[PDB]
Amino acid sequence: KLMRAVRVFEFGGPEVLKLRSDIAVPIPKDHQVLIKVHACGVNPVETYIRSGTYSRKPLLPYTPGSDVAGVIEAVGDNASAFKKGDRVFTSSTISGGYAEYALAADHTVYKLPEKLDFKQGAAIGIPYFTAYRALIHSACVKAGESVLVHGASGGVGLAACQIARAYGLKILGTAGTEEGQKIVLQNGAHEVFNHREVNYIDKIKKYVGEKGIDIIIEMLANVNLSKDLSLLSHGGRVIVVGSRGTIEINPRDTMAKESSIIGVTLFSSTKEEFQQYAAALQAGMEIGWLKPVIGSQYPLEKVAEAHENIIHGSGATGKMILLL
Amino acid sequence: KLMRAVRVFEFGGPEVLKLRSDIAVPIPKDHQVLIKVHACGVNPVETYIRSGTYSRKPLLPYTPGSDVAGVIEAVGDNASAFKKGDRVFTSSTISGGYAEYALAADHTVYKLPEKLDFKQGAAIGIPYFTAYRALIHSACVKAGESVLVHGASGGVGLAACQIARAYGLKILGTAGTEEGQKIVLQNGAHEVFNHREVNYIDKIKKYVGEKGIDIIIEMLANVNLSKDLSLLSHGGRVIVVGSRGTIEINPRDTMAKESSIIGVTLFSSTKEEFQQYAAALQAGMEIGWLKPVIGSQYPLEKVAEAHENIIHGSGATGKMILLL
Ligand SMILES: NC(=O)c1ccc[n+]([C@@H]2O[C@H](COP(=O)([O-])OP(=O)(O)OC[C@H]3O[C@@H](n4cnc5c(N)ncnc54)[C@H](OP(=O)(O)O)[C@@H]3O)[C@@H](O)[C@H]2O)c1
Ligand SMILES: NC(=O)c1ccc[n+]([C@@H]2O[C@H](COP(=O)([O-])OP(=O)(O)OC[C@H]3O[C@@H](n4cnc5c(N)ncnc54)[C@H](OP(=O)(O)O)[C@@H]3O)[C@@H](O)[C@H]2O)c1
Ligand SMILES: [Cl-]
Ligand SMILES: [Cl-]
Ligand SMILES: [Cl-]
Numbered sequence: 001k002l003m004r005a006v007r008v009f010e011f012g013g014p015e016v017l018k019l020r021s022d023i024a025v026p027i028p029k030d031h032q033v034l035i036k037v038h039a040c041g042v043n044p045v046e047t048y049i050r051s052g053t054y055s056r057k058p059l060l061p062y063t064p065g066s067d068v069a070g071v072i073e074a075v076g077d078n079a080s081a082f083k084k085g086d087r088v089f090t091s092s093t094i095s096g097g098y099a100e101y102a103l104a105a106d107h108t109v110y111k112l113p114e115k116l117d118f119k120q121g122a123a124i125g126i127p128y129f130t131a132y133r134a135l136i137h138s139a140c141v142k143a144g145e146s147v148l149v150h151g152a153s154g155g156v157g158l159a160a161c162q163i164a165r166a167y168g169l170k171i172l173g174t175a176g177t178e179e180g181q182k183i184v185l186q187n188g189a190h191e192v193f194n195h196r197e198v199n200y201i202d203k204i205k206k207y208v209g210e211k212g213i214d215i216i217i218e219m220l221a222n223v224n225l226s227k228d229l230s231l232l233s234h235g236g237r238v239i240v241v242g243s244r245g246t247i248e249i250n251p252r253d254t255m256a257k258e259s260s261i262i263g264v265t266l267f268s269s270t271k272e273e274f275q276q277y278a279a280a281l282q283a284g285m286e287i288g289w290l291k292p293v294i295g296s297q298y299p300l301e302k303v304a305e306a307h308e309n310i311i312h313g314s315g316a317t318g319k320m321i322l323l324l
Numbered sequence: 325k326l327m328r329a330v331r332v333f334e335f336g337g338p339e340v341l342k343l344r345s346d347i348a349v350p351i352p353k354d355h356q357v358l359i360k361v362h363a364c365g366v367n368p369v370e371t372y373i374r375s376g377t378y379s380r381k382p383l384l385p386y387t388p389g390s391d392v393a394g395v396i397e398a399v400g401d402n403a404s405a406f407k408k409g410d411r412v413f414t415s416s417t418i419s420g421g422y423a424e425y426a427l428a429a430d431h432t433v434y435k436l437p438e439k440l441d442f443k444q445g446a447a448i449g450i451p452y453f454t455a456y457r458a459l460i461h462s463a464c465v466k467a468g469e470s471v472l473v474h475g476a477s478g479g480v481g482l483a484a485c486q487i488a489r490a491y492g493l494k495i496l497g498t499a500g501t502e503e504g505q506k507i508v509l510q511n512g513a514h515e516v517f518n519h520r521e522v523n524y525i526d527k528i529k530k531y532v533g534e535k536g537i538d539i540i541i542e543m544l545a546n547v548n549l550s551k552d553l554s555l556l557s558h559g560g561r562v563i564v565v566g567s568r569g570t571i572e573i574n575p576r577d578t579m580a581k582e583s584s585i586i587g588v589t590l591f592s593s594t595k596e597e598f599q600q601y602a603a604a605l606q607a608g609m610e611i612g613w614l615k616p617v618i619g620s621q622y623p624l625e626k627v628a629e630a631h632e633n634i635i636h637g638s639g640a641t642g643k644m645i646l647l648l
């Protein structure tokens with residue numbers, strides 16, 4: 001049995017993402033399951049991996065993608081939590097999610113509540129688990145604190161707005177377009193700003209006044225970190241979620257406020273931590289505040305475009321997904 | 325009724341530090357005490373204040389200095405914890421410590437154990453309180469963790485080495501001279517490096533290997549913060565104690581390690597925190613690990629030289645003090 005899958009044979013630009021229709025369908029064993037993929041999330045980390053310059057360099061060739069949603073097609077003998085026909089989503093796969101079928105370890109697969117479709121299931125894995133770790137673990141947020149989600153219109157950003165809202169925070173978000181701004185306001189933000197405007201930081205400061213902001217969830221630290229330090233309240237923290245370069249800062253900016261700059265990586269989470277996050281996000285999905293938003297959809301054939309556009313495109317309006 | 329005191333009539337360089345011998349001796353009231361000063365510590369912050377460019381900007385003229393040691397000369401009505409003849413040291417003064425007699429608020433005055441001399445009492449106030457906050461409060465130190473004291477040969481540096489030693493930490497330190505390196509080794513560092521050497525960071529790297537360093541106490545974050553991030557263990561933290569400029573950093577350096585950059589300022593401490601720290605340090609003095617180290621001594625008349633040399637001199641070998 002054969003399938004369509006994206007294969008990378010060598011590292012490089014989006015052009016290295018090959019569509020092949022002659023890829024063997026994996027056969028799950030032991031604790032593995034096989035998922036018939038309906039959609040797969042596109043995460044910016046997949047672009048870094050593909051470029052060959054990220055800290056993870058998979059063995060070539062490989063199929064990209066960690067975040068699928070679909071239906072269990074087959075199970076290994078010990079993958080007792082799942083059966084054929086189960087609607088599921090993932091935070092990892094073994095064989096790669098950019099494919100008609102994906103092999104995954106049973107502990108990186110979760111049931112998909114009936115009220116979320118497969119497109120939404122594909123938005124969950126990295127974005128919502130990352131946002132939850134950043135807020136609950138890294139920032140140790142408390143109800144009533146203020147948060148700025150700096151890059152709120154994409155996958156992690158909207159997830160952060162929804163979690164922050166559920167956990168009782170005062171929420172500011174930024175977006176680069178009018179439509180992105182609108183979506184951010186529909187998903188938890190009390191107030192939104194345009195990060196392409198010359199004076200938007202002034203507008204944020206006018207808005208928060210002298211007390212400043214308790215938490216900043218930063219998607220683009222190489223552009224924003226110094227400005228972030230000026231916005232922090234006394235004892236405030238900026239969580240470095242995303243970063244794509246270097247930045248000049250004044251370390252004195254942390255001193256009088258005793259503020260913190262704190263890095264996060266979802267990959268660093270323990271198994272116990274993932275189980276905690278999964279339980280939190282399942283509760284969100286069933287109560288109904290966890291409602292993933294899909295901003296763009298690409299057929300598998302247009303994977304090079306998807307990669308290009310997630311890094312260089314016009315502006316996010318939610319999660320970008322591949323449709324199978 | 326007359327005393328000798330340093331007086332600053334206008335902000336500027338070391339040349340603004342004048343000597344006067346006709347200053348009226350202050351009269352303590354309410355919770356104030358008067359201290360007959362034997363020695364006063366020189367803290368770098370006094371040079372920033374003197375320049376007129378620090379956030380604290382005193383009314384002119386003033387006498388500099390927060391950290392004195394001597395004997396209680398007189399007490400206000402309500403300063404019940406003190407009596408004439410008590411040996412004491414300070415972490416603040418009201419009238420200025422660069423003087424034969426200094427007025428101080430009773431809550432910023434602490435008993436000096438008989439076995440420490442007044443020269444050593446002058447080294448305690450800002451240095452040891454700051455280092456204890458940095459290690460205990462900011463870093464949340466646990467025994468057996470590793471620490472680099474980056475700038476270990478000065479007042480806060482040696483304080484940090486001794487506190488770290490009392491916690492059984494694995495201790496690395498840096499100094500800029502042969503004599504500086506030896507004093508750091510003498511006060512608890514397992515290994516020392518020369519921060520004037522080209523590629524001394526590589527020597528530290530080779531020495532700590534892949535596991536890295538749990539805690540960095542950073543005296544000069546504008547020079548070292550980026551190199552610090554490369555040295556940190558997973559969950560590692562660099563505490564910004566001193567900083568005199570800007571620095572380019574890569575925020576991705578915090579992400580894979582989930583490391584933190586944390587500002588500290590001693591004068592952010594609550595009353596309750598100061599009491600906690602005082603209790604810790606009193607125990608340190610009693611049990612014998614808190615043994616202040618005097619690197620250089622200046623008569624009051626050479627205060628201008630002392631300010632010049634603390635910023636621009638040949639290298640620290642402990643606390644710099646003024647002798648009355
Ligand atoms: N630490 C981790 O474990 C972890 C996990 C997941 C993701 N990440 C990283 O976090 C970042 C966000 O991931 P994602 O999935 O949300 O990506 P995404 O869906 O592509 O969203 C990118 C976000 O960046 C925003 N942005 C553009 N210019 C900005 C600026 N000047 N200031 C602030 N934000 C700006 C975009 O806003 P507009 O489109 O509206 O302009 C959009 O909201 C990526 O760099 C990713 O690699 C890290
Ligand atoms: N955050 C706060 O509340 C607080 C409190 C007290 C002090 N401080 C600040 O902390 C800093 C240290 O205070 P201190 O009283 O210990 O000053 P100090 O007694 O003058 O000591 C200065 C130290 O900095 C070192 N140094 C010189 N070049 C260095 C380099 N390239 N990298 C790392 N260290 C280097 C010196 O080493 P060598 O002489 O051997 O070259 C010496 O150990 C000052 O900037 C001060 O303003 C902050
Ligand atoms: Cl990938
Ligand atoms: Cl986002
Ligand atoms: Cl005082």
Ligand SMILES: [Cl-]
Pocket residue numbers: 475476477478479480481482543
């Ligand atoms: Cl020092």
